[PDB]
Amino acid sequence: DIKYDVVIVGSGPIGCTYARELVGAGYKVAMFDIGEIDSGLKIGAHKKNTVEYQKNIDKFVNVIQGQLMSVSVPVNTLVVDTLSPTSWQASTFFVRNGSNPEQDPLRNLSGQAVTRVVGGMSTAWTCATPRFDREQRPLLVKDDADADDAEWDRLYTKAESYFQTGTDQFKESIRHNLVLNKLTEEYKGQRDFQQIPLAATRRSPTFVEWSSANTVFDLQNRPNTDAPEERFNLFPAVACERVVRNALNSEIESLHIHDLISGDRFEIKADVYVLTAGAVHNTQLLVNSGFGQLGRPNPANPPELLPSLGSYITEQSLVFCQTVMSTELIDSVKSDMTIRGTPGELTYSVTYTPGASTNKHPDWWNEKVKNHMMQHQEDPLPIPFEDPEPQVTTLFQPSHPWHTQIHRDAFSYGAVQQSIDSRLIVDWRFFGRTEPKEENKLWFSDKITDAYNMPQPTFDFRFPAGRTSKEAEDMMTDMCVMSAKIGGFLPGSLPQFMEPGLVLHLGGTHRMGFDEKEDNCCVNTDSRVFGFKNLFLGGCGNIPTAYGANPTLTAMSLAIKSCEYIKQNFTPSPF
Amino acid sequence: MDIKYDVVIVGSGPIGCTYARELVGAGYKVAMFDIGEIDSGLKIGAHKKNTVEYQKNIDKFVNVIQGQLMSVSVPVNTLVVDTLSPTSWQASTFFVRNGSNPEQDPLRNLSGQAVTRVVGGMSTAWTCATPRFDREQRPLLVKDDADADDAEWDRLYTKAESYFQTGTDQFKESIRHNLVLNKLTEEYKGQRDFQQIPLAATRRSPTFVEWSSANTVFDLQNRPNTDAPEERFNLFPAVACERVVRNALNSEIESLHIHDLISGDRFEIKADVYVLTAGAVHNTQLLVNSGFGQLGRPNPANPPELLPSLGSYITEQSLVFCQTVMSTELIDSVKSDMTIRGTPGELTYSVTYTPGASTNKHPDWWNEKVKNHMMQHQEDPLPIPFEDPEPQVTTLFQPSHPWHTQIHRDAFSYGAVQQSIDSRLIVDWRFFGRTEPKEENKLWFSDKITDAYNMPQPTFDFRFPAGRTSKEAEDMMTDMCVMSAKIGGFLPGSLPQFMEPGLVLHLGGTHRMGFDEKEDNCCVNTDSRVFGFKNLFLGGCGNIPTAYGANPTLTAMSLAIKSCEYIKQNFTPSPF
Amino acid sequence: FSYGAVQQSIDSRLIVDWRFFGRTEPKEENKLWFSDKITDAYNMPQPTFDFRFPAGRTSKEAEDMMTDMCVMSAKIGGFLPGSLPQFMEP
Amino acid sequence: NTVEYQKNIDKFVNVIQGQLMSVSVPVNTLVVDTLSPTSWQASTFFVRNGSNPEQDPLRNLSGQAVTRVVGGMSTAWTCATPRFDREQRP
Ligand SMILES: Cc1cc2nc3c(=O)[nH]c(=O)nc-3n(C[C@H](O)[C@H](O)[C@H](O)COP(=O)(O)OP(=O)(O)OC[C@H]3O[C@@H](n4cnc5c(N)ncnc54)[C@H](O)[C@@H]3O)c2cc1C
Ligand SMILES: Cc1cc2nc3c(=O)[nH]c(=O)nc-3n(C[C@H](O)[C@H](O)[C@H](O)COP(=O)(O)OP(=O)(O)OC[C@H]3O[C@@H](n4cnc5c(N)ncnc54)[C@H](O)[C@@H]3O)c2cc1C
Ligand SMILES: Cc1cc2nc3c(=O)[nH]c(=O)nc-3n(C[C@H](O)[C@H](O)[C@H](O)COP(=O)(O)OP(=O)(O)OC[C@H]3O[C@@H](n4cnc5c(N)ncnc54)[C@H](O)[C@@H]3O)c2cc1C
């Protein structure tokens, strides 16, 4: 079709929030994604939701790695001086293999990467959806903190519903409670610990249905039996390239796409254009469309439109280690048990007294330990083989201004090993907040292009001196101190800062504020691009503040608010 | 789910899809079970590399393969970690941990062997090479009449090739492909012939190849449907097939016991015909879990009741691998027909050729692509266009070089990524040796240890046989070193090496075919029917009883087609 | 020698080293010169190399010498993993 | 020529590496981007640690090194003393 009420670029969780809202409200919606349906019969669903992946969670790191394509790889300068004399040998470090010659390797976010599949990165994410407290969060209401808090509560509540956020899906994990209780005790009165809030529904003791874009909106074309009055079409393998501005710069007139299967290019018309292509690619599509400044920043000629586009970018510092559980904590697991005799032998019985007030642990815990120690008497640990992973956090606070995850999950790194029993291993990830600075930028080459023939992204980024840097190092030390209470570092996973941007929490590339000039921003609190009646941006690129927590829930909340504007200001076509 | 089908197939890989395609088409009521799930988009069982993104970022596809390959038998780990904090819990022994197999001798393993549980099986990830076996590598379907035998294999392979859409033309306009092909052709001339690797694939565009898969064989859609209103097929993903039930006389299978992994329910499914296409390892597992062969560590003093050759005479290929960096001479040859004046990057620079000159070394299409690359990309120091498709060259197995060869680029489990050398220069070398079948080389199943699906844990007892297998394997290494030198020197970091045993994933002979159970030490006859059993058939590389170097799937498909011929001759489809 | 990072898994009695040494044609353009600004640890002009193996005979032989080591070494044994055939740093 | 080295011959490599000082090390351009943000961090690949900025890393003899001990490299060498045939000889 040539004409829609709304077109949405990208099928990640944020595009899906606009689809859920606007498709539900009766709009003829088209959604385009440059990537394809892979994921199974549930379009855009979490790839970790297969029996095989949940039996072999360490293999999922491979899936993640296989769909994270680096944003900007500087030109390689490794010296290979052991080629055969007959082999063709370089005289210079020329531009090879997709590298970016615009990129200073020392001012990069080398770990930054993007995913191009239907459902975006929600096909592989780790589902942590905390709310930001005031300190981390931009204002949606000026001069009324209580009204501002109320608005965010209303939006986050809906967002949590859409993602199926919960804080009890790991409540009966031994490892989770083990870690939770010890940290709760150690910081008693000083910090609070809880389960990471997770966009997930537990289906069985050994299976968790992790949420994804599909959870937000199932991405099935409509009308269909289950929604005969709704109108939605998803078009995968369509690279969206430009929004066409009118000469007056007050309205978008079309979206120019490239159908990657036929190879043909089309102009799609809509009343309302929503860009939810991610924090990098939203900015890319805007710059390729005449917003901001194409090429190396040049203050001499400021751009015509959106001069803050691609400036004030933030990415979080991330420190990481893994620990091996202390003897003391492992011994405490079986503290309630009565242990008759010698394991393997007839004289082995393991029993406990349900409800005994002297017991350190609940009955659900002892029953599982007992059963494990009795079913597996050769095994030297008291933790059940199927015990779900820990999922503990102490949330960002002024006296510890970083987000924390004390957990086990699959990421692009954490290349786990086989010599140490996995039941012993806990991951530590602390996330710092980065002050937004005009000098930190994502820009796009006016000569170099990427694999889809669009302007090559280039970072110019350093963690700002002052608070960001002081905090990041204070965060490291906090991780070293806190993790030492649970066990010592796992060799091969010693405490370290991760490559800039590997954390994938980039924000502020197309930031939100109330006033374009005063707040140095690109979209207002309805996520509308300043000056344009019908152009909206969604995603973490909107977030203008220094945040430690995981941003997606916050980007979703902004999107819900955006949709309220859209619904108030545009009327659906007749069906 | 019904209680009753005409045919049930275990496994939705390309071999199971061969039985589905034949049997569904002939009007049988078919059910197919796979323990894994739908994972390749809307085209069920399709090749996961058929995305625009993967074909633009082909190095990334290694991670997909690695993510779905689950190792078969991992010996207990004895790595010393002695720098734990004194507070951390520490083992006193190297105990059974993290899924490891205490049965497995680490020194007599196929440590690289791995399986994939996804609908479409390993054909969601494979490299699509589908050569025929020559007589030397191939089991006999007709004894004492080599022309009847040749005629039967030709008919079956031709059919197999249509199902896979095998061809040898998809890479014909690649400059790198032709550069290597013509060089090796000239250098060997009259000693070895070279051609494109036969590939199960159809090119869609200059930048995209639709790799074939199980889906290409059979689309895996439930039937009847608008397209196939008179066919009957249901696929049931996430169902672990556990045992076939023998009647008391051991002359028939009475049902298949399944475990639906989502609901946890268990059922006994009844069919006229039972087909096991669960792969070389898992077919054997299922059969042993059903009282065929011998459960547990082999014990010759307790000879099995049934199928004594089951899981013996296993073969797996020796694999040697390197990469090379293209010679300066060959790179200069790419631009042999060009006239180049001025200095690159200046407006006086030009690159031209004489179209049609019979003294041109290359054809016009080549020279135009070089011209355009050099004129539009004057900062680039190489003459090869950026999106030039990869080489896909082979000289097939012959008695004077008894190994298969691939001189190509592809995504495999071990395709480690380097960025210092331009990828246009890099060619992969994979030479694959044939392994003599020997009784002592075994896949067996623990009577104590179980796998992730609570089935008997697979254990290998394998070494490459002394004598011809070993001699060839090493002569194969040398051949790779000699041939490859003609194209370029090795790429540091990919020096010539034997790969981990079983990484190549060409295991055969676990349930091997022969004419006579005893005399040929085998488990199925040439209809792929299990000896003694009217209605049990095995399909897959497990059937192949010979020493082969070439990639085995086409051959197993051809056997599967023959097997279906017997089925159609002996079982009537139920009326619609 | 300076290279050879020790291994213990394979019995040393089995291990044999192969070192083949090529001859390099003398070319005027292959140079050792000394900086007029940078100095070394004893305050003398810093040595600098400008060197490549000459194309032509020197390169062709070096690669044929590689192939010859692979061919000859195979008569004695296969390569030790971790000491696979390689050109050493110039 | 110590009983200890000839009983532990793999350890002699370390003696060799210990006295071979590289002749020309080009300026280092390894990217270390996981420093703490509070650590002093370079804006350029400047001349560090004895490196030679005259040296093109791609036209070097990077393995060339010298020994500054009495007896020179003969304190470490492998003692192979073949004659040159005519072809190799001035
Ligand atoms: C391993 C991993 C772990 C993470 N875990 C956490 C976590 O626990 N919590 C947290 O909040 N976040 C986490 N994240 C980040 C989270 O996934 C993102 O913040 C979120 O997915 C962003 O949603 P989005 O819809 O804005 O964009 P994306 O999910 O990036 O999706 C946008 C999409 O647009 C498409 N697209 C891009 N360019 C174009 C174009 N030009 N034309 C058409 N389509 C286009 C894509 O193909 C893609 O599907 C994780 C990410 C990964 C990779
Ligand atoms: C990276 C890669 C490259 C390869 N390249 C080539 C090549 O170029 N040429 C070629 O000839 N071969 C190659 N192969 C090997 C080829 O993929 C296999 O030979 C082929 O897939 C075997 O087909 P099959 O149907 O017998 O088995 P599989 O493809 O292994 O399918 C068997 C299936 O049965 C299932 N299953 C297993 N156990 C059970 C059970 N108990 N219950 C129910 N279902 C079960 C699985 O989940 C699976 O889908 C390669 C393989 C890989 C992974
Ligand atoms: C591990 C090893 C293996 C080798 N194996 C072989 C082999 O088996 N066969 C063989 O032919 N070659 C071998 N060599 C090379 C051989 O060692 C040299 O060719 C030989 O030592 C050169 O002798 P020379 O006296 O000219 O120089 P050197 O041995 O280099 O001695 C020169 C000396 O002069 C000194 N010097 C340098 N500058 C000054 C200065 N400005 N003022 C005062 N003194 C100065 C030194 O400190 C030094 O002792 C080997 C070398 C090494 C290190």
Name the residue of chain B whose CA is nearest to C55's CA: B328
Q: Name B70's bridge partners.
A: B115
Whole-angstrom Cα distance, residue B396 to residue B400?
A: 11
**Sign of the CA dihedral with D6 first, then D10, D15, and D19 last:** positive
Query: Which residues 6+ apart lie within 8 Å of D23 measured at CB?
Result: C47, C49, D61, D64, D65, D66
Give the three-state DSSP class for B245: strand
Spacing, Cα D51 to ligand 3 middle (Å)? 22
Q: Which residue in B478, B485, B492 is closest to C86 by CB distance?
A: B492
Spacing, Cα D67 to ligand 3 middle (Å)? 7
- Interface residues of chain C, partner chain A, Cβ below 8 Å: 52-53, 55, 58-60, 62-63, 66, 86-90
- Kindly give the number of the ligand 1 atom that is closest to the alpha carbon of A198: 8
DSSP string, B298-346: --TTS--SS-TTTTBS-B---EEEEEEEEBHHHHHHHTTT-EEES-TTS
Whole-angstrom Cα distance, residue A547 to residue A511?
A: 13
Of B121, B106, B95, B126, residue with least CA distance to B15? B121
Report residue B492: phi and psi, to 5°: -55, 135
Q: Which amino acid is residue A93, in one-letter code?
A: F
Give the three-state DSSP class for B444: strand
Query: Which residues 6+ apart lie within 8 Å of A80 measured at CB?
Result: B420, B421, B492
Q: Which residue in B474, B481, B492 is closest to C67 by CB distance?
A: B481
What are the catalytic residues of B? 506, 551
Q: Name B267's bridge partners.
A: B258
Of A21, A9, A140, residue with least CA distance to A570? A21
Query: Which residues 6+ apart lie within 8 Å of B454 measured at CB?
Result: none
Q: Which amino acid is residue B421, in one-letter code?
A: I
Judge residue A387's burial from the number of C-beta atoms within 10 Å of its C-beta, 0-12 exposed, 13-18 middle, 19 or more buried: buried
Range(s) within chain A of domains with CATH label 3.30.1920.50: 326-387
Tokens 């609570």 belong to: B454
DSSP letter, residue B508: B
Question: For B180-201, what is the HEC assignment?
Answer: HHHHHHHHCCCCCCCEECCEEE
Which tokens sit at A3? Answer: 């004409």
Distance of CA B172 to the CA centre of its chain: 23
Question: For B265-293, what is the HEC assignment?
Answer: CEEEEEEEEEEECCCCCHHHHHHHHCCCC
Whole-angstrom Cα distance, residue A48 to residue A410?
A: 9
Q: Look at ligand 2, atom 3, and give the residue with the nearest C-alpha.
A: B126
The answer to whether D and B touch (≥3 CB pairs < 8 Å) is no
> D53-80: b or e for each residue (b if 16 or more CB lie within 10 Å)?
ebbebbbbbbebbebeeeeeeeebeeee
Pairing of strands B497-498, A265-275: unpaired
Whole-angstrom Cα distance, residue D48 to residue D46?
A: 6
Disruptive mutation site among C38, C39, C44, C53 for chain D (greatest number of D CBs within 10 Å): C38
Q: Name A391's bridge partners.
A: A407
Q: Look at ligand 2, atom 52, and give the residue with the nearest C-alpha.
A: B126
Query: Which residues 6+ apart lie within 8 Å of B112 measured at CB?
Result: B71, B499, B500, B501, B502, B503, B504, B505
DSSP letter, residue B549: -
Spacing, Cα B340 to ligand 1 middle (Å)? 47
Distance from the first to the final alpha carbon of chain C: 15
Count Cα atoms within 13 angstroms, Cβ side, for A283. Answer: 36
Asked about A505 being catalytic, the answer comes back as yes
The answer to whether A and C touch (≥3 CB pairs < 8 Å) is yes
Long-range contacts: B144-147, Cβ < 8 Å, 24+?
none
Contact B287, B276 (CB under 8 A): yes
Count Cα atoms within 13 angstroms, Cβ side, for B162. Answer: 8
- Kindly give the number of the ligand 2 atom that is closest to the alpha carbon of B14: 25
Which tokens sit at A9? Answer: 């670029």
Pairing of strands D65-66, D21-22: antiparallel
Q: Name A32's bridge partners.
A: A9, A235
Q: Phi-psi region for residue A357, left (φ > 0), alpha (ψ -120 to 50) or beta?
A: alpha
Q: What CATH code is assigned to A326-387? A: 3.30.1920.50
Question: For B104-140, what is the HEC assignment?
Answer: CCHHHCCCCCEECCECCHHHHCCCCECCCCCHHHCCC
Name the residue of chain B whose CA is nearest to C77's CA: B474
Domain B327-388 is found in CATH 3.30.1920.50: yes
Which tokens sit at A73? Answer: 């790889």
Contact C53, C62 (CB under 8 A): yes
Count Cα atoms within 13 angstroms, Cβ side, for B346. Answer: 7
Whole-angstrom Cα distance, residue C38 to residue D51?
A: 10
Which tokens sit at B386? Answer: 């950026």
Spacing, Cα D14 to ligand 3 middle (Å)? 17
Whole-angstrom Cα distance, residue A396 to residue B110?
A: 49
Whole-angstrom Cα distance, residue B379 to residue C7?
A: 45
Q: Look at ligand 3, atom 49, and give the residue with the nearest C-alpha.
A: D72
CA distances from A150 to A145, A566, B299, B448, B455 (A): 9, 21, 74, 60, 55
Of D46, D51, D3, residue with least CA distance to D26? D51
Report residue D22: phi and psi, to 5°: -60, 140
Q: Which amino acid is residue A556, in one-letter code?
A: M
DSSP letter, residue D57: G
Alpha helices in B348-431 (DSSP H): 364-376
Tokens 């010393």 belong to: B80
**Sign of the CA dihedral with D54 first, then D58, D61, and D66 last:** positive
What does chain A come to in residues? 575
Ligand closest to D70 (CA) is: 3
CA distances from A396 to A140, A196, A478 (A): 20, 12, 13
Whole-angstrom Cα distance, residue B180 to residue B332?
A: 13
Whole-angstrom Cα distance, residue C46 to residue B261?
A: 71
Tokens 């949405």 belong to: A8
- Resolution of this PDB entry, in A? 1.9
Of A537, A522, A544, residue with least CA distance to A434? A544
Whole-angstrom Cα distance, residue B543 to residue B523?
A: 8
Query: Which residues 6+ apart lie within 8 Å of B95 measured at CB?
Result: A378, A379, A380, A421, B76
Of B240, B211, B172, B153, residue with least CA distance to B390? B172
Q: Is the CB of A511 under 6 A from ligand 1?
A: no
The answer to whether C and D touch (≥3 CB pairs < 8 Å) is yes
Contact A268, A255 (CB under 8 A): yes
Which tokens sit at C32? Answer: 């050792």
Whole-angstrom Cα distance, residue C46 to residue B281?
A: 64
Q: Which amino acid is residue B224, in one-letter code?
A: P
Whole-angstrom Cα distance, residue B115 to residue B325?
A: 32
Q: Which amino acid is residue A63, in one-letter code?
A: V
Which tokens sit at A21? Answer: 């809202």
Whole-angstrom Cα distance, residue A173 to residue A170?
A: 5
Whole-angstrom Cα distance, residue B544 to residue A446?
A: 58
Spacing, Cα D75 to ligand 3 middle (Å)? 8
Q: Name A349's bridge partners.
A: A340
Contact A472, A507 (CB under 8 A): no
Outline where DSSP puts E strands in B199-250. 199-205, 208-211, 232-237, 239-246
Peptide bond into A228 cis (omega under 30): no
CB contacts, 8 Å: B80 with chain A: 419
DSSP letter, residue B239: E
Judge residue B203's burial from the number of C-beta atoms within 10 Å of its C-beta, 0-12 exposed, 13-18 middle, 19 or more buried: middle
Q: Which amino acid is residue B274, in one-letter code?
A: Y
Contact B70, A52 (CB under 8 A): yes
Q: Which residues line ligand 2 (CB under 6 A)?
A: B 10-16, 33-36, 65, 116-118, 121-123, 125-129, 240-241, 277-279, 282, 286, 412-413, 505, 540-541, 551-553, 556
Contact B161, B185 (CB under 8 A): no
Judge residue A518's burial from the number of C-beta atoms within 10 Å of its C-beta, 0-12 exposed, 13-18 middle, 19 or more buried: exposed
How much is the CA Rg of chain B, to the nearest whole Å?
A: 25
Contact A410, A61 (CB under 8 A): yes
Q: How many CB pairs under 8 A join C and D?
A: 55
Distance of CA D89 to the CA centre of its chain: 28
Query: Which residues 6+ apart lie within 8 Å of A103 measured at CB?
Result: A72, A73, A74, A75, A458, A459
Distance from the first to the final alpha carbon of chain A: 14
Report residue A55: phi and psi, to 5°: -85, -5
Pairing of strands A391-393, B426-433: unpaired
Peptide bond into B458 cis (omega under 30): no
DSSP letter, residue A39: S
Contact B302, B473 (CB under 8 A): no
Whole-angstrom Cα distance, residue B58 to residue B168?
A: 21
Give the three-state DSSP class for B236: strand
Q: How many CB pairs under 8 A join A and D?
A: 52
Kindly give the interhelix angle for B553-570 and B14-25, rounded to the nearest 10 degrees: 30
DSSP letter, residue C38: E
Disruptive mutation site among C67, C76, C80, C83 for chain B (greatest number of B CBs within 10 Å): C67
Outline where DSSP puts E strands in A341-495. 349-351, 391-393, 402-407, 425-432, 441-449, 455-460, 487-489
Which tokens sit at B55? Answer: 């074909």
Range(s) within chain B of domains with CATH label 3.30.1920.50: 327-388
H/E stretch holding B21:
helix B14-25
Q: Look at ligand 3, atom 38, and give the residue with the nearest C-alpha.
A: D68
H/E stretch holding A244:
strand A238-245
